[PDB]
Amino acid sequence: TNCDREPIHIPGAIQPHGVLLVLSEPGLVLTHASENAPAVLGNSAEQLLGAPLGHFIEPSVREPLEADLRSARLKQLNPLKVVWRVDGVDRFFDGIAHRHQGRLILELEPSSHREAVPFLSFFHAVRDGLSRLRDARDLQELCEAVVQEVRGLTGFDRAIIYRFDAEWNGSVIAEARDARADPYLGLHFPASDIPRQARELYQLNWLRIIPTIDYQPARVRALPGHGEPLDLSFSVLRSVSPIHLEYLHNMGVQASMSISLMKDGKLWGLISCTQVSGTRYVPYEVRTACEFLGEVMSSLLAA
Amino acid sequence: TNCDREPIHIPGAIQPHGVLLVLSEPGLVLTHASENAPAVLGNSAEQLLGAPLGHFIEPSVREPLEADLRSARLKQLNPLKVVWRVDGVDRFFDGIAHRHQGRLILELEPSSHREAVPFLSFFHAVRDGLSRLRDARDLQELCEAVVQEVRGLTGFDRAIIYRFDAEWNGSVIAEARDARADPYLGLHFPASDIPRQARELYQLNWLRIIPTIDYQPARVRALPGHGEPLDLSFSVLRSVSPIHLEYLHNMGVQASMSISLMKDGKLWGLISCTQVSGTRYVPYEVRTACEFLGEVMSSLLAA
Ligand SMILES: */C=C\C1=C(C)C(=O)N/C1=C\c1[nH]c(Cc2[nH]c(/C=C3\NC(=O)C(C=C)=C3C)c(C)c2CCC(=O)O)c(CCC(=O)O)c1C
Ligand SMILES: */C=C\C1=C(C)C(=O)N/C1=C\c1[nH]c(Cc2[nH]c(/C=C3\NC(=O)C(C=C)=C3C)c(C)c2CCC(=O)O)c(CCC(=O)O)c1C
């Protein structure tokens, strides 16, 4: 059987800090809703399933949101501004929507604290980060620049560059760390620690975040006739493989984030961040800044 | 005498769509002010020279603005939010401040129309642009991607990649254009069209914009004992060489913007945009998005 066979893209559940909805097209009827929607949204699955999205959206946000969800050209439009009028009292969310395997999936994460101008942090993060990455004169300086930059933006206890060999064993070739985190720099690990179906998924979906490894997976409920396993390959809230969560627990890690490094269309390595402390709910603008720096580093893996 | 000798970094004047101030440190006393300040700011040079900056700033913006100007770490903090309370009635500006040759220069450009969330356009421009640049498989596709991207963001009639040879002659190696603009693709030009002191300045200051070639230069006035030619090398409002403005007039160009392409610390080429139509007051977020794409392209000039 071994490591490579557990699926991972169809867990049937999400990480409960956000809500996952599936929307029909073109009508935007909710055909799936994750069952943590009462805690996060103020509505039940029963109120949600089969209702049109617009019924729950503050009316002045509604028309542009529906226009974006139908756009196809959908991020490029992410993040979507979603304002949920429940009882009502608005709740504010960043929507990340995508199409995959014929379904339109909308993920909702509570909008960040502040007031502190939208997208200003991303502007500074990628400008300052790009010039630090360009200062690097070789691969090893590039790696150290990225890991210092990502740890600064996220606050993670540890950030490494994890590089794959021929073979798919990995090596910790650069590390930035708080002093509370043991040093993994220089360690090599077998290929099965990131098994083959994970590596294949990470060639397509370049960012994953587990802000706490202790969560109760929120099942995705569906209208009768619907689900059938939801392919969650491109969903940021996808519940991750339980055996990886026990790897993290045994390693003493409470939260994780990694970013794929690509070279010639093939997975080259990861930027891997870990928290030994407590949780790490990285905000949207920070995650996206980090993933953007991973793309820059990936494009600089040349000569 | 010839082309290489006219200075260009000390014209004594600026392009009048913004205001240039020089500030003492640490006290932020205005020692220089451009003479278009009545039109743009609502104050005269006489009211400005020798007054502390804070006297003109809306009080809730004032402390953070002064903190930034003293920071050193100054962009990284650009753009500064500057709210000018004159009579009073607030006016809103993006401040771009820099230190050079011992002076602290603050340039003020009216804040953009809207309402349309700050920095959202930059977020989308650099994300969408980076992935189009990464799609390029060789230098020629890179060049065509950049020129299509920059023309899309700015609306310029023409955008070219202008590459320097051994020698500093130039070649138009890629072009995107409205059909109203004659094609320069494939043309070669002598080194003197971008003379040596311009090329040296452009190795240090990677962006220049002339939103209309028909402007009355606004003299920079100074307190007695002060100016002495203000070195405007890193100032975005620097009035450009009059002979270049007549080159543009004869070429039939009403507005221009170029971005330096760097390779191994040496000027490699320019992204050059021209308007045959009318003016081109490119907004701050667009200019910065374009310059960021120029840095990415510069970093990809490798192998
Ligand atoms: C055969 C089953 C598995 C064994 C044994 C094992 O050790 N992992 C197994 C399955 C598995 N791993 C992952 C994802 C994963 N694994 C890592 C490994 C590391 N994290 C570190 O900090 C270090 C060394 C310092 C290593 C090595 C990483 C980075 C990841 C990516 C996720 C993350 O960033 O935390 C999966 C997929 C989990 C999922 O995507 O659902 C599986 C099934
Ligand atoms: C000896 C004096 C000069 C002669 C003769 C001439 O032709 N230019 C001279 C001086 C000069 N040029 C510049 C800056 C400059 N020149 C160009 C040239 C081109 N623009 C085009 O569209 C093309 C071809 C399609 C060419 C060739 C460019 C792009 C620039 C940069 C400024 C801009 O983007 O418009 C200067 C410096 C002007 C300044 O920075 O003050 C000078 C003195």
Author numbering:
A (entry chain A), B (entry chain A): 16 to 318
Per the authors:
S. aurantiaca contains two previously uncharacterized bacteriophytochromes (BphPs) denoted SaBphP1 and SaBphP2, which may be responsible for the light-stimulated growth of multicellular fruiting bodies. The classical BphPs switch between a red absorbing state denoted Pr (λmax ≃ 700 nm) and a far-red absorbing state denoted Pfr (λmax ≃ 750 nm).
The SaBphP1 and other myxobacterial BphPs lack a conserved histidine (His) at position 289 in the GAF domain. In the classical BphPs, the equivalent His forms a critical hydrogen bond to the BV ring D that stabilizes the Pr state. SaBphP1 contains a threonine (Thr289) at this position, which is replaced by glycine in some myxobacterial BphPs. The wild-type and mutant CBDs both crystallize in the dark in the Pr state in space group P3221. However, the T289H mutation hardly changes the overall structure of the CBD dimer as the root-mean-square deviation (r.m.s.d.) between wild-type and mutant is on the order of 0.3 Å. Since the CBDs do not form stable Pfr spectra, but the PCMs do, the PHY domain is essential for the mechanics of the photoswitch.
